[PDB]
Design a protein around this ligand. Sequence first.
Ligand SMILES: C[C@@H]1CCO[C@@H]1C(=O)Nc1cnns1
Length: 182
Amino acid sequence: MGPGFDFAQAIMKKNTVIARTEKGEFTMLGVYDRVAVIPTHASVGEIIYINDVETRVLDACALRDLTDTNLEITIVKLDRNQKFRDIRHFLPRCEDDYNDAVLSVHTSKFPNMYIPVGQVTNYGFLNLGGTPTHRILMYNFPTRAGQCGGVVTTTGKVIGIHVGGNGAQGFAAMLLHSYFTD
Ligand SMILES: C[C@@H]1CCO[C@@H]1C(=O)Nc1cnns1
């Protein structure tokens, strides 16, 4: 409807796939080459379905900070025959707050879904499903089951992926440029 939704659509249309694990269907953001991200609670194993195609997982790393605290991001390298558009230049370098963000989801259950979530707070610490988690972004929108893995953007930046909520607020794990240096 406006430039926020324009940027989010541009990311969704080239840099997402539908990922299926034994724990469900997730929005999965492709970052560069065959490297993507997904919430750690998706429990990626040796095989994953990408757009309903059986795909070998070449590497999967559940990220933690240097305090050995969960970040809820798993970086996955896929045995796929095609590269993602490289979007690493849209990732922020540092932890921050944001205005006027969009949460965008694409699954079987929720295709072509875009939510204007508004102001994003650098929340920091969250006890997420009983697990101490750092680098959490918060927005005041009643997100639901089915939105995990959704991409959080502002105009010009890809800032996080949706990892939970409490019925009133939603929570995303930050994406930082430093996670994807090669
Ligand atoms: C639905 C589950 C079970 C009960 O509470 C959980 C929850 O709030 N999930 C989410 C909210 N927003 N995004 S995921």
